[PDB]
Design an enzyme around this catalytic site. Structure first.
Site, short mmCIF file in Angstrom:
data_model
loop_
_atom_site.label_atom_id
_atom_site.label_comp_id
_atom_site.label_asym_id
_atom_site.label_seq_id
_atom_site.Cartn_x
_atom_site.Cartn_y
_atom_site.Cartn_z
N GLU A 65 1.01 -0.98 -0.34
CA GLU A 65 0.09 0.12 0.39
C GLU A 65 1.14 1.24 0.27
O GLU A 65 2.28 1.80 0.56
CB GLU A 65 -1.06 -0.25 1.44
N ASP A 93 -1.91 -5.18 0.93
CA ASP A 93 -1.66 -3.66 1.68
C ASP A 93 0.39 -4.18 2.23
O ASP A 93 1.14 -3.50 2.04
CB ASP A 93 -1.96 -3.58 3.31
N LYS A 119 -14.06 -8.28 3.50
CA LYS A 119 -13.50 -8.61 3.27
C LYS A 119 -13.00 -9.71 2.78
O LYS A 119 -11.73 -10.30 1.70
CB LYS A 119 -12.61 -7.68 3.72
C1 T8I Z 1 -10.83 1.43 -3.32
O1 T8I Z 1 -11.32 2.57 -4.17
C2 T8I Z 1 -10.27 2.88 -3.83
C3 T8I Z 1 -8.82 2.22 -3.70
C4 T8I Z 1 -7.64 3.31 -4.16
C5 T8I Z 1 -6.58 2.10 -4.30
C6 T8I Z 1 -5.88 1.00 -3.79
N1 T8I Z 1 -7.39 1.22 -2.70
C7 T8I Z 1 -6.72 -0.45 -1.81
O2 T8I Z 1 -5.69 -0.87 -1.41
C8 T8I Z 1 -7.59 -0.15 -0.48
N2 T8I Z 1 -8.97 0.58 -0.23
C9 T8I Z 1 -9.38 0.56 1.01
C10 T8I Z 1 -10.31 1.45 0.76
C11 T8I Z 1 -10.75 2.70 0.20
C12 T8I Z 1 -12.20 3.21 -0.03
C13 T8I Z 1 -12.89 3.61 0.71
C14 T8I Z 1 -14.19 5.10 1.35
F1 T8I Z 1 -13.65 5.71 0.67
F2 T8I Z 1 -15.20 4.24 1.15
F3 T8I Z 1 -14.05 5.22 2.55
C15 T8I Z 1 -12.72 2.74 2.13
C16 T8I Z 1 -11.27 1.86 2.24
N3 T8I Z 1 -9.35 -0.19 1.84
C17 T8I Z 1 -8.30 -1.01 1.48
O3 T8I Z 1 -8.14 -1.99 3.06
C18 T8I Z 1 -7.13 -1.65 0.66
O4 T8I Z 1 -6.18 -2.46 0.29
C19 T8I Z 1 -7.56 4.53 -3.88
C20 T8I Z 1 -8.92 4.79 -3.76
N4 T8I Z 1 -10.11 4.02 -3.88
MN MN Z 2 -6.24 -2.81 3.02
MN MN Z 3 -4.31 -1.62 0.00
#
Ligand code: T8I
Ligand code: MN
Ligand code: MN
Ligand code: QQ4
Length: 180
Positions: A65, A93, A119
């Protein structure tokens, strides 16, 4: 669009964590200026991942990450190809060299069980490790193996609750919880 949330997240999190969250959201077509709750959640997840990798020994983890998509996948391929572990469907991550497995860090405003099962339904090839931290102070890990020391997880939990407190002092915690 000048929101209290955005200025708070910039005052609350490390400048580098802030920049990484900004790059990652813009890459995904989202705007941190106007989608501010999600900006805060991304910063929180980032800081928890960094804090987590700071636990344990020094060569222990590989941080996935916080990288650009292509280089994150390059490292995942190097990992799979040198260690022989199966390649995961989605970008995790971290990677634990000590236990030889990928780690998926989650951070939720809901009950940890629901987040974990969510998840887990999207990784069918269930060889990777899931570790969920809540904002209220608990956690849950695959096969009850919490990977890290008790003190390290406790630091993470304290930090999440301090974030939640400071948000609620500015009356931004309600909008944040009721947004996931
Ligand atoms: C998912 O969309 C995204 C994805 C990214 C880059 C890749 N992402 C991850 O790898 C990731 N992303 C999240 C996550 C994303 C958004 C929220 C929100 F906004 F809904 F609160 C909560 C958790 N949790 C994780 O555990 C995790 O590994 C960049 C931007 N947006
Ligand atoms: Mn994550
Ligand atoms: Mn991630
Ligand atoms: C290596 C570098 C950044 C790391 C991310 C992370 C930052 C870490 C710094 C801690 C330790 N310290 C030490 C000095 C003071 C301090 O706070 N923390 C955690 C809390 C806030 C913070 O700052 N870590 C962990 C290893 C060392 C390091 O710096 N990252 C970003 C994604 C990939 C990666 O490995 N890299 C590498 C290339 C791009 C980049 O930015």
């Amino acid at each position: 669009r000048g929101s209290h949330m955005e200025d708070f997240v910039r005052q609350c999190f490390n400048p580098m964590i802030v920049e990484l969250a900004e790059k990652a959201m813009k890459e995904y077509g989202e705007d941190p200026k106007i989608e501010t709750n999600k900006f805060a959640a991304i910063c929180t997840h980032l800081e928890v991942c960094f804090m987590y990798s700071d636990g344990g020994s020094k060569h222990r983890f590989e941080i996935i990450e916080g990288r650009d998509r292509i280089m994150a996948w390059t490292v995942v391929n190097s990992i799979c190809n040198t260690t022989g572990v199966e390649k995961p469907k989605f970008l995790p991550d971290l990677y634990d060299y000590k236990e030889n497995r990928f780690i998926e860090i989650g951070v939720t405003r809901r009950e940890v069980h629901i987040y974990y099962l969510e998840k887990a339904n999207k990784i069918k090839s269930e060889k990777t490790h899931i570790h969920i931290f809540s904002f209220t102070g608990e956690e849950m890990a695959t096969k009850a193996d919490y990977t890290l020391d008790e003190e390290s997880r406790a630091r993470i939990k304290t930090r999440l609750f301090t974030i939640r407190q400071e948000m609620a002092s500015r009356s931004l915690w309600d909008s944040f919880r009721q947004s996931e």
